[PDB]
Subunit: 262 residues, 3 copies
């Protein structure tokens, strides 16, 4: 159903079955499929295609030439009714693509809230983007990539399939990420390597100096101690008992499958 | 003429003169020029621009915001009635651009069959893409580039004008290809360099172990022997008399103009 | 007002207040906002969005899926009535984005005349592009970037915020520019470094051999002398008294804020 207070441009094509929330705005030449849900106050500027089994939250701004919920690019995909979930207050810029999941990959592509996805950012099938992230122009995620809370992916940067980009990470522009990036880490290069802790990001986000110190110490255990990851895991866990922010490392390690960028 | 069984959306603009085949589907807000031929069963999803002297085959899927047959970006081009040919069963994704040829470059941009051209792939004037190729997101071909059968161009990768990407090549993501890549070769970097034979690709495509061995031996003659290309050409030709797959090298050498990546 | 000789496609949406000049052509499914001025003979092919406080000159060609005058991607922007200015005879290709300025950055994004902006080129808020420039496919300018007259930005190349790309510069494809590039310089790499003078560009543009020699000598003072920039500035200024072309360096130094690529 289309809410009585939603605006639907006469030139827009909203298929019967679509759910459009209160004070939503569907601009000129948009197409909205029958399995799409668009939340209260969400705006599709113009020339937006939303299809598939796709749920979009509240107060989103989706710009022209974006394609949301579209068939993914995995040759394994066969037309199964897979899904996209997008949260609230995202800014999804011109030409952004967010593709539906695959059954093989869990069936769901998910984007959280308060993210900025810049021009031609690509969120492939089975990706999970958290909250407060930034993907700069042309930032490209292959299938099954996680981008955790507050992580920033620089302009022109691509991420290899299955990789995890940890919370509060900053990946520099013109980079190629081939392995997992621990939380709080600055990454740059092709292929990307680690360049210390994202101190500036943590400062601005209200991290205490004790927490930043602890995180820096965890970083040093991983990259400067000369020990294996298996050796330092318990040390990092111990540190997390005093500084809860360090637990982010422990949680990340349990999800990591591709090894760490080094 | 538009076939009686073709669907043309009321909002689509198909110019008189366009040929649209049986069971083709022209989606909302598409524009199809008067010199365009669209084959049986081909689908233009929505918001597709097809113009120029452009022939498109059967069972193609062309996604929103793609531009096919458009004026090329060569400053030398002056509006001459040059051409685009696209074969059958291609998947041409969102924002892909395929531009018409130039008179200077032979007048034809050609794409074969069963290719996957991912989001914002660019096929410049006078390019020739073969069959079963993959161009990943933002893969960019400059003018007069050949991409031979089964070749894969990784995400964010660009190819310098006049370069030949050989059959069964795999070019890694985030690469810049400045010279010719022999068939069967793995290429990566900026500028791209060779990293052995695409053994996995050949395996999956049904190449015998004898053929793969012969190809590896040819690779070694080129890159490991320390001999010049002129010296090894006849040796490679001799090898091809037993293993026909090696002839791909010989055929490639005769087309190569920019030297080999090394 | 819309000039009596301008063409506006029945499917195009031109908002009352828009100014459209003589013999302009607004193609199918274009949207033109109420604060837009489009000059004599300018063509919007189809599916173009032009909005904001945006002035576009004469004889421009703007291709499908381009977005001109749109809200910029700076999180600092709050909806202020900032501006875009575009000059004459530009070729603005498919999916190009040119964003409005920010109050913080001076309020104006400016593009000159006779430029070629290739597919998915991005001109961020507060950028200044001069005349006769080329931005190749996916060339991406961050905020507040200057691209001076005749400068060429290669395919897939990104430029860090606040950087100045000097007059007659050639930046190679697949590059990342993190600092200022003096006029006449060839730049390449990630991050980009200098590779001598753009001799070929200068030749073609009618530079005398005496001027090219003087420019090469200035280049050598900067990069080969082993002296600091402060030391060579007066030497370069002295040289400019005989060869006026060298003054471009002096003018550039006064604008440069990020240091020189080295
Ligand atoms: C330096 C960083 C650069 C990163 C650049 C990333 C660009 C991403 C662009 C967005 C694409 C996205 O929308 C689609 C998605 O990534 O699909 C794929 C899907 O996520 C995956 C898993 O489900 O499966 C497919 O990719 P792969 O064919 O690479 O599968 P794989 O990762 O499981 O295969 C592993 C091995 O195949 C090897 N291989 C394959 C083919 C070949 O010819 N040669 C070869 O060696 C390759 O070396 C690799 O080690 C899928 N592809 C296709 C074409 O079907
Ligand atoms: C590390 C790999 C990075 C690859 C990045 C590739 C990005 C491609 C983006 C797609 C563009 C495509 O759609 C258009 C096509 O490539 O057009 C050109 C056309 O294929 C060509 C031949 O016909 O001619 C033109 O390109 P060039 O101006 O480079 O011609 P050229 O290759 O024959 O010139 C050779 C020499 O010119 C030199 N040059 C030119 C200008 C200058 O200011 N300085 C200079 O040195 C340059 O160094 C080079 O060695 C054409 N361009 C223009 C702007 O007219
Ligand atoms: C190798 C070259 C690669 C280049 C790649 C360029 C890709 C450009 C894509 C186009 C984007 C453009 O349309 C938008 C524009 O660039 O916006 C920004 C605006 O031009 C800027 C100044 O006004 O301010 C913002 O960028 P920054 O957040 O980087 O501001 P800054 O440059 O003043 O900050 C300086 C320091 O912040 C540091 N920082 C920030 C966050 C963080 O988590 N960690 C961190 O270290 C960072 O290291 C840097 O040294 C703006 N961004 C946002 C998201 O608001």
């Amino acid at each position: 159903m289309i809410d009585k207070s939603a605006f639907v441009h006469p030139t827009a094509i909203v298929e019967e079955g679509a759910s459009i929330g209160a004070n939503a705005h569907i601009g000129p030449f948009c197409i909205v499929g029958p399995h799409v849900e668009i939340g209260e106050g969400t705006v599709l500027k113009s020339h937006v295609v939303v299809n598939g089994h796709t749920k979009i939250g509240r107060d989103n701004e989706i710009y022209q030439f974006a394609s949301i919920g579209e068939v993914n690019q995995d040759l394994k995909y066969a037309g199964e009714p897979t899904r996209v979930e997008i949260g609230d207050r995202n800014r999804i810029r011109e030409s952004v693509t967010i593709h539906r999941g695959t059954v093989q990959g869990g069936g769901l592509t998910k984007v959280g809230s308060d993210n900025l996805l810049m021009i031609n950012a690509h969120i492939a099938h089975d990706c999970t983007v958290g909250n407060r992230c930034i993907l700069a122009n042309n930032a490209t995620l292959a299938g099954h990539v996680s981008v955790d809370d507050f992580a920033i992916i620089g302009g022109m940067t691509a991420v290899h399939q299955f990789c995890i980009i940890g919370a509060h990470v900053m990946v520099g522009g013109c980079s190629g990420v081939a392995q997992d990036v621990p939380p709080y880490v600055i990454a740059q290069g092709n292929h990307a390597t680690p360049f210390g802790v994202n101190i500036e990001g943590l400062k601005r986000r209200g991290f205490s100096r004790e927490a930043i110190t602890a995180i820096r110490n965890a970083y040093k255990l991983i990259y400067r101690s000369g020990k294996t990851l298996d050796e330092v895991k318990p040390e990092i866990a111990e540190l997390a008992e005093t500084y809860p922010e360090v637990k982010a490392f422990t949680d990340f390690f349990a999800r990591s499958t591709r090894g760490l960028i080094r």
